[PDB]
Design an enzyme around this catalytic site. Structure first.
Site, PDB file in Angstrom:
ATOM      1  N   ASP A 135      27.349  19.623 -16.339  1.00  0.00           N
ATOM      2  CA  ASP A 135      26.776  20.190 -17.560  1.00  0.00           C
ATOM      3  C   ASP A 135      25.375  19.722 -17.920  1.00  0.00           C
ATOM      4  OD1 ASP A 135      29.883  20.423 -19.459  1.00  0.00           O
ATOM      5  OD2 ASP A 135      29.461  20.843 -17.389  1.00  0.00           O
ATOM      6  N   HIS A 173      23.498  21.607 -20.761  1.00  0.00           N
ATOM      7  CA  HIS A 173      23.423  21.902 -22.189  1.00  0.00           C
ATOM      8  C   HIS A 173      22.067  21.793 -22.876  1.00  0.00           C
ATOM      9  CE1 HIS A 173      27.479  23.109 -22.887  1.00  0.00           C
ATOM     10  NE2 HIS A 173      28.005  22.011 -22.385  1.00  0.00           N
ATOM     11  N   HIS A 217      33.789  25.340 -12.596  1.00  0.00           N
ATOM     12  CA  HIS A 217      33.409  24.683 -13.830  1.00  0.00           C
ATOM     13  C   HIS A 217      34.489  23.871 -14.515  1.00  0.00           C
ATOM     14  CE1 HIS A 217      30.969  23.744 -17.227  1.00  0.00           C
ATOM     15  NE2 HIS A 217      31.915  24.164 -18.035  1.00  0.00           N
TER      16      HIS A 217
HETATM   17 MN   LIG Z   1      32.366  23.709 -20.274  1.00  0.00          MN
HETATM   18 MN   LIG Z   2      30.090  21.658 -21.459  1.00  0.00          MN
END
Ligand SMILES: [Mn+2]
Ligand SMILES: [Mn+2]
Ligand SMILES: COC[C@@H]([C@H](O)[C@H](O)C(=O)NCC[C@H](C)c1nc(/C=C/C[C@@H]2O[C@]3(C[C@@H](O)[C@@H]2C)O[C@H]([C@H](C[C@H](O)[C@H](C)[C@H](O)[C@H](C)/C=C(C)/C(C)=C/C=C/C(C)=C\C#N)OC)[C@H](OP(=O)(O)O)C3(C)C)co1)N(C)C
Length: 293
Positions: free
Chosen positions: A58, A60, A167
């Site tokens: 991740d 983000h 994921h």
């Molecule tokens: Mn996620």
């Molecule tokens: Mn995430």
């Protein structure tokens, strides 16, 4: 679409103070979305990759940390990359983040890969940040274009027939790799089912089999589900992201599954480190730790 100009402009912020924006022209961003979408659709929904490659969890919207990742792992095309999803939301710079990643995918389509995370979904990024960022800096139509692009992202990958990458995690409905291969794109994420599970599930050391997931959707799975999964498909390891872990990565079920999170100090509150995994030709792994800066 002048890709080199875009990449250079995005990288100019290097060695600068986090927060500095890069304001690309609207048509350029729209261009990246349409061009990358074209490429996503021409490549399989279940990627078949070869090592060596660096795998990242991740991001983000923490653009300055993404730059640090490339700094330690080497900028493309010096190293092949595979991102596990979740490029937008939470962080303050989702645009620069996704744009740089899309530009690299366009420039090096065969050496740079991006998978779909649960945040590459309109209903999710509508709430967690991306939508607000798009609206504030450009407009809603741009956000909609991003959605079209996102709906075409591949869902999983298998490195050298031994490392399964997705994921979130496994699904009780996943009996054959064929099932993933038949998912048609473009598509959004359902509220339940295979596609949903692959983007939303998490491993749980305290569950036997399948369990309820605290996120409010999908399931959690135990160590035995992992072992059985790996064995029947003749794989050695499962690699995923989705869950923030304090040290950037965490092994599960005797190193049969690894969780990667590449956003240090997530949300500005957790004091977690970020990590990136390197897989060489012999499939031996090495992990680079990124201390929160
Ligand atoms: Mn996620
Ligand atoms: Mn995430
Ligand atoms: C039990 C033990 C077992 C191992 C366990 N541990 C986990 C996950 C662990 C990570 C947790 O992380 C936190 C903090 C701690 O609790 C953990 C660190 O908790 C948050 C998550 C939030 C959830 O993920 C969802 C965003 C949230 O429920 C929201 C309301 C639900 C929405 C919008 C849903 C469903 C939409 C579904 C839409 C669908 C399908 C289709 C369409 N359209 O709550 C879990 C944040 O996590 P984030 O990673 O940032 O999201 C964190 C604050 C980071 C699962 O098992």
């Amino acid at each position: 679409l002048n890709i080199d100009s875009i990449i250079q402009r995005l990288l100019e912020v290097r060695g600068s103070k986090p927060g500095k924006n890069v304001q690309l022209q609207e048509n350029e961003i729209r261009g990246l979305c349409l061009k990358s979408r074209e490429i996503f659709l021409s490549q399989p929904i279940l990627l078949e990759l070869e090592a060596p490659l660096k795998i990242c969890g991740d991001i983000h919207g923490q653009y300055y940390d993404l730059l640090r990742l490339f700094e330690y792992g080497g900028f493309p095309p010096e190293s092949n990359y595979l991102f596990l999803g979740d490029y937008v939301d939470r962080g303050k710079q989702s645009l620069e983040t996704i744009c740089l990643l899309l530009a690299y995918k366009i420039k090096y389509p065969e050496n740079f890969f991006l998978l779909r995370g649960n945040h590459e979904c309109a209903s999710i990024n509508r709430i967690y940040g991306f939508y607000d960022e798009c609206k504030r800096r450009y407009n809603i139509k741009l956000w909609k274009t991003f959605t079209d692009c996102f709906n075409c992202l591949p869902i999983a990958a298998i490195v050298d027939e031994k490392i399964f990458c997705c994921h979130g995690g496994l699904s009780p409905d996943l009996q054959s790799m064929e099932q993933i291969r038949r998912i048609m794109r473009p598509t959004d994420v359902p509220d339940q089912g295979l596609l949903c599970d692959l983007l939303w599930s998490d491993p749980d050391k305290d569950v036997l089999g399948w369990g309820e997931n605290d996120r409010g959707v999908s399931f959690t799975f135990g160590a035995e589900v992992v072992a059985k999964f790996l064995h029947k498909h003749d794989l050695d390891l499962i690699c995923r992201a989705h869950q923030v872990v304090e040290d950037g990565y965490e092994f599960f079920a005797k190193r049969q599954l690894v969780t990667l999170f590449s956003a240090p100090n997530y949300c500005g509150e957790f004091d977690n480190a970020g990590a990136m995994m390197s897989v060489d030709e012999t499939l031996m792994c090495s992990f680079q730790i990124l201390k929160p800066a």
